[PDB]
Design a protein around this ligand. Structure first.
Ligand SMILES: Nc1ncnc2c1ncn2[C@@H]1O[C@H](COP(=O)(O)OP(=O)(O)OP(=O)(O)O)[C@@H](O)[C@H]1O
Ligand SMILES: [Mg+2]
Lengths: 468, 44, 498, 466
């Protein structure tokens, strides 16, 4: 305890402690910082004779060399329990809402914990109805499993996440946790607050069943780096007691980018495109905690931001192996005014199994992929030679594929702000029936423009009849 | 009709060549950037 | 029993790497112990990699948050080793040989050192005994033999693990001991794999060596070498499986790209100079050490074999990347799985045009070798005429029937999951298809046809299957005895169904 | 002459020697192990104060930081002589075959030798007589020249190697050397040893006429780096006697790769795509000892593996900078029962000019590969026209092309005991005369399949008459 700061390189602070009182690897140290408020850093490395390198998790732009640092002796401890329900927290577990601080009697748990062992893993999963045609058909949202959407900058990751929360947050059957790691505080939060506080479940709002940890784009790298772990610690308590948890982490990428900035300031040898050497291990340590165990289940939905539009970037490439369901949003689809923007051929799911999801659902999904695979195989021929050169059955498959592309589009209840289309909730059964009817041949006479921004097939037929 | 179809196909092929040239140049710049970055990292 | 051990002091512990100060007379890959101290009742081992002047940079096989500056490390005299023997069959063990399924301790008597020299230059033998994958496409066009290392390379989600698990499940009675090394794979997926193996009763001869993503990069780095040592012991000493001294091992590295990532992490944390794509310079050496230990020893050295099935994911189907090209160079054959073929209904998704098996017909049964030549030729020729198929509609009747036969053969290979076909069944189906007995069947029903056909042979005539299996090693498989009672069975099935 | 190990990082060993007894830049370190054998390193960088950085040549998984090291003064010494014939060796010259060690009486030569001076080089290129029709016609070799096969497995490359060894051993004295650099131990060993031991000529196995040195992928980068030089020294011993030597450096590219790794672990600053800065010089020091002097000629036919299919890559480009001929083995020709899978096209040779081979040899070699210049492009037309029923004159060209494609095949002596057909050795003059007379039209009377496996046009005629 009672060290002194030696160097301040960015948000990385090197501090010298007594020889026999060096802080451990993940302990939390504190700069008094004056004014009655302190800066909580987290140790990352031990460099020698009492020298430790830590991450500020704060502004760290007004403190000098030689400032004293006090070693708490424990890692970051965040409140857990029902006291955290309906409250908004920092990475440090300190509430930022107007309500008072969490009481001392509330249990404090470290944000660094071992992930569930191999024994505790629960491999049982079942389909989770979400009301989105493309998600419930091509890449089913998995109950008790890990799923994520990989989208570029211009695609609607936020819109899809908000629609998912609106659809599945009223009938939770349990509590929920939302982590806003590296996301806009305009929409990513403070309007999810408006939507979550407005939604009511039998006189109890959805916000009353939600623990929200933020650490968004404005925060320094340390906060964005450890906010995910804080949210996981707050959700693991509810999972361990048996309560089902809906976990919504935002931009797991932003979690990885911060790790990259922290590693760059820490002097580690860079790997690939400036990323940290310990990318896979950090991703594993965060993600293996997001697991449904035999004591409780976590239904996790994540977002991932692809830099530029490169799906081969190390961060999404590392995420891809940690998911049960993958949903790929493409800019090319989005620029076609297909706001769901999901690419059916690049979106998969583990529970898309005839034993799990149903024989008819499986057959319909496989056919809806075989079509649009025939379309992707013929994109260049249509581009250069044109539609005429294809055979008759190839023309039919291409027409059905383009109709299917238009039909995957669907208005969202949270999209009324900039789109005039009222939102639509299509059950999985209706989606399967609509796509089976479309594949059979019903709707061939219908022009493709009538499949755009519609619900099930009955809505398309009604629109066609209205157009006569 | 064949003359018109081949004129349209040639125009489409020229447009596709322009798009592929843009993509190839982007890939070339990315490859040079990656090469110099890894060479500088190995030197340092 | 007091002994004197060499002790060093941890002077700098970081992201799984510790500088151990004075540990003189330490072997270049020993296991430093980190004896338990106040707050930790267990030992966290490490591998002393860099033996620099006045420093021992050691990667840590475990969680490094407990290790603190100034802690004493005792150098165990043993090089990194893994327990081996009969006791590991049916057990999930982390790369250190410690069970992680919690079914009890690992009963063992021998600990083989990982990172061993290759079995030998003249000690090997020609690969002749086939490995029956159970997938028609692999078993007919890209054969795998005992002692042949066959890469499974593909995109992120195309069926690589599915192919590996199908191969593991098929080795029920073929005297094979499977090993599944899961490198960097999420613990839930390893649990799913273990559940699949247990469901089909394939956990009486399988060893799962899992170093999941959360576990330190040192464990993932040594994950394949452990397990490869297990297979080395199996091929060199054998294990009692089903009352037989089995000396054949089939090791499947779940993802060698993740192993290369782990090696890159441990190298860059050791501050070793990078190379191409930030990987260390000797990563081709890394994988060549591991894969060249899979060999088919001659009868003088035991006659055992070790079959390796590395798995690689490629970003955007870029098989020109660094690690994919390295492992393609190392291996004896490649199985390319494509998302384009996977989505189009071709479930095994093998790109038979570019998939190659350098062992060739020597890794096939004489029946399969005799039958699959026509299959390969017709499939290649159909791929050649796909150009005319896409555009031309004025092709003559010969080319129409030719492309139709190609489609017949392609639809024959659309095998489902967890439904392996034994050698006799595949031989019968390929004989039926190649001898024009399947021409009248329309394409969408062929798979169903095949399935129904097998049920016929499983109910109407088991003796034809027994006859096919019994004399599958003869030089001329279409024996007049074999040729009859099989064409008769096919014709009988034709009348019964449609 | 005894130093102490200072650092051990992978396969790079730093060793401090006494001030006045520092080893030279390519000497051997020869670390002694406890169990009787020794670990022979190779110095790479003199530095500091008596400190030398060397490449391991071995595992280095049992070495401390105080072990003594005994400088050998000379570079890696390899046994050379008639004794080292029909035996398999590693990079260090230790026989890895079942038979016993090489006797002390056999001369040991340094692995590193100076390539022949400019004055000794031949002032005129000379064709190398192999006996294979397609090789001696389309892509003739060079005495003291380099040739690369671009072919996978199952195309008969091993049989081509065996026949080349047999032909050079029969027509000339023709001792042969085979350096498997970075090969699969399955393909390189026990599928080359057994095939060459089984293959026989004049009651003598091919393996009895061939030296083998094998640095496989499992060995450290230094071993794969210096196995080529070991084979060069063994071949150069016989070349000094005036005897012609045929050397097969299988996967010369794996040599380059090895050097790259040796540089990356040596701290050398990377060049181009991670490759070593000393790429051209390292390749020259190996490819310049393969030349035709006055006393004798070391003809080399190497194998090149290009990563992916990139000939722009620095390793294939550096290899091609030292190549005289390319032979392109193809799957399509091999699966058509054409035993020599050499593609008439995509197989070039700089000797194929009228100044060296001769005007007639060049003229016919241009007459052939011209009817196939289109690769019978008629085959595309036949596919959508059916030859328009028949071509005005093209149908003849198709017949001639099919006949010559069949005629490129030749019965090999090494396969004589497999297919039961005697091996045919065809001189280059016989090949040129046969192909010229076939192109004149003398070969328009015999049907196809009469050229299927016959050595000369005259041999085809004898068959037609009988
Ligand atoms: N017949 C089949 N053969 C192979 N794969 C199939 C088949 N039918 C479905 N699949 C798909 O294969 C999946 C099995 O996992 P797979 O082998 O594709 O994993 P992987 O290639 O290791 O990918 P990841 O990197 O995502 O773990 C199933 O969940 C399903 O999506
Ligand atoms: Mg896998």
């Amino acid at each position: 305890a009672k060290g002194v700061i030696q160097e301040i390189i960015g948000v990385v602070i090197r501090a010298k402690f007594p020889e026999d009182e060096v802080p451990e690897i993940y302990n939390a140290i504190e700069i008094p910082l004056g004014n009655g408020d302190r800066l909580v850093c987290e140790v990352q490395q031990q460099l020698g004779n009492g020298v430790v390198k830590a991450v500020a998790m704060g502004s760290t732009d007004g403190l000098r060399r030689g400032l004293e640092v006090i070693d708490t002796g424990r890692p970051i401890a965040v409140p857990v329990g029902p006291a955290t329900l309906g409250r908004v927290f920092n990475v440090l577990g300190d509430p930022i809402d107007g309500m008072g601080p969490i009481g001392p009697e509330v249990e404090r748990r470290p944000i660094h914990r071992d992930p569930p062992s191999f024994e505790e893993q629960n491999t049982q999963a079942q389909i989770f109805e979400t009301g989105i045609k493309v998600i419930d058909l091509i890449a089913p949202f998995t109950r008790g499993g890990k799923t994520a959407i990989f989208g570029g900058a211009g695609v609607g990751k936020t819109v899809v996440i908000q629609e998912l929360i609106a659809n599945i947050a009223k009938e939770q059957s349990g509590f929920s946790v939302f982590a806003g790691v590296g996301e806009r505080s305009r929409e990513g939060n403070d309007l999810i607050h408006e939507m979550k506080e407005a939604r009511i479940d039998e006189n109890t709002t959805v916000f009353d069943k939600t623990v929200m940890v933020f650490g968004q784009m404005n925060e320094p790298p340390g906060a964005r780096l450890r906010v995910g772990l804080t949210a996981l610690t707050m959700a693991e308590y509810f999972r361990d007691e048996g309560r089902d948890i809906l976990l919504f982490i935002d931009n797991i990428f932003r979690f990885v980018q911060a790790g990259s900035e922290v590693s760059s300031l820490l002097g580690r040898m860079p790997s690939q495109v400036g990323y940290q050497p310990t990318l896979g291990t950090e991703m594993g340590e965060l993600q293996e905690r997001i697991t449904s165990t035999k004591r409780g289940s976590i239904t996790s939905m994540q977002a991932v931001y692809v830099p530029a539009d490169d799906y081969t970037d190390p961060a999404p490439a590392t995420v891809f192996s940690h998911l049960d369901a993958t949903i790929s949003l493409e800019r090319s689809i989005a620029e076609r005014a297909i706001f769901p923007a999901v690419d059916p051929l690049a979106s998969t799911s583990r529970i898309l199994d005839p034993n799990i999801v149903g024989e008819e659902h499986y057959r319909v999904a496989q056919e809806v992929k075989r079509v649009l695979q025939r379309y992707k195989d013929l994109k260049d021929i249509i581009a250069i030679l044109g539609m005429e050169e294809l055979s008759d059955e190839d023309k039919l498959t291409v027409q059905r594929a383009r109709k299917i592309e238009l039909f995957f589009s669907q208005p969202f209840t949270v999209a009324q702000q900039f789109t005039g289309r009222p939102g639509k909730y299509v059950p999985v059964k209706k989606t399967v029936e609509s796509f089976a009817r479309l594949l059979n041949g019903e709707g061939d006479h219908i022009p493709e423009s009538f499949f755009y921004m519609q619900g099930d097939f009955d809505d398309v037929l009604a629109a066609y009849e209205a157009s006569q | 009709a064949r003359m018109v179809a081949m004129r349209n196909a040639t125009n489409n092929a020229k447009d596709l060549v322009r798009d592929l040239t843009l993509s190839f140049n982007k890939a070339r710049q990315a490859a040079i950037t990656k090469e110099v970055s890894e060479i500088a990292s190995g030197a340092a | 029993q007091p002994r004197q051990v060499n002790v060093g002091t941890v002077i700098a512990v970081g992201d799984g790497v510790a500088r151990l100060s004075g540990l003189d007379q330490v072997v270049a890959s020993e296991i430093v112990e980190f004896p338990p101290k106040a707050g930790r009742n267990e030992s966290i081992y490490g591998i002393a990699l860099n033996l620099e002047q006045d420093s021992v940079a050691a990667i840590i096989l475990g969680d490094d948050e407990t290790i603190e500056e100034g802690d004493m490390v005792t150098s165990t005299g043993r090089v990194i080793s893994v327990p081996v023997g009969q006791g590991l069959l049916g057990r999930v063990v982390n790369p250190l040989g410690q069970p992680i399924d919690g079914k009890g301790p690992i009963v063992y008597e021998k600990t083989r050192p990982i990172e061993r020299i290759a079995p030998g230059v003249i000690t090997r033998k020609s690969v002749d005994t086939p490995v029956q994958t159970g997938i028609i496409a692999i078993d007919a066009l890209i054969p795998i033999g005992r002692g042949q290392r066959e890469l499974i390379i593909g995109d992120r989600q195309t069926g690589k693990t599915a192919v590996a698990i199908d191969t593991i499940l098929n080795q029920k009675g073929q005297g094979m001991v499977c090993i599944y090394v899961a490198i960097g794979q999420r613990r839930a997926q390893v649990a799913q794999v273990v559940g699949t193996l247990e469901r089909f009763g394939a956990m009486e001869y399988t060893i799962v060596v899992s170093a999941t993503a959360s576990e330190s990069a040192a464990l993932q780095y040594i994950a394949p070498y452990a397990g490869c040592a297990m297979g080395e012991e199996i091929m060199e000493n054998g294990v009692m499986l089903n009352g037989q001294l089995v000396k054949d091992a089939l090791i499947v590295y779940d993802d060698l790209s993740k192993h290369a990532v782990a090696y890159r992490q441990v190298s860059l944390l050791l501050r070793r100079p990078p190379g191409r794509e930030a990987y260390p310079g000797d990563v081709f050496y890394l994988h060549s050490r591991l894969l060249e230990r899979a060999a088919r020893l001659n009868e003088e050295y035991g006659g055992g074999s070790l079959t390796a099935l590395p798995v690689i994911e490629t970003q955007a189907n870029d098989v020109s990347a660094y690690i994919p090209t390295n492992v393609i160079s190392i291996t004896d054959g490649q199985i390319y799985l494509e998302s384009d073929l996977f989505n189009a209904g071709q479930r095994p998704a093998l790109n038979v045009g570019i998939s190659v098996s350098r062992v060739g017909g020597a890794a096939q049964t004489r029946a399969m070798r005799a039958v699959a030549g026509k299959l390969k030729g017709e499939l290649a020729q159909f791929r050649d005429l796909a150009a005319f198929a896409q555009f031309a509609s004025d092709l003559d009747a010969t080319t129409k029937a030719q492309i139709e036969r190609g489609q017949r053969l392609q639809e024959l290979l659309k095998q489902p999951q967890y439904q392996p076909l034994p050698v006799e069944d595949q031989v019968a189906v390929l004989y039926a298809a190649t001898n024009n007995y399947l021409d009248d069947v329309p394409v969408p029903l062929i798979t169903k046809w095949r399935d129904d056909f097998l049920a016929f042979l499983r109910t109407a005539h088991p003796e034809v299957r027994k006859l096919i299996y019994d004399n599958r090693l003869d030089r001329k498989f279409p024996t007049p005895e074999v040729k009859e009672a099989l064409e008769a069975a096919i014709k009988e099935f034709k009348a019964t169904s449609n």
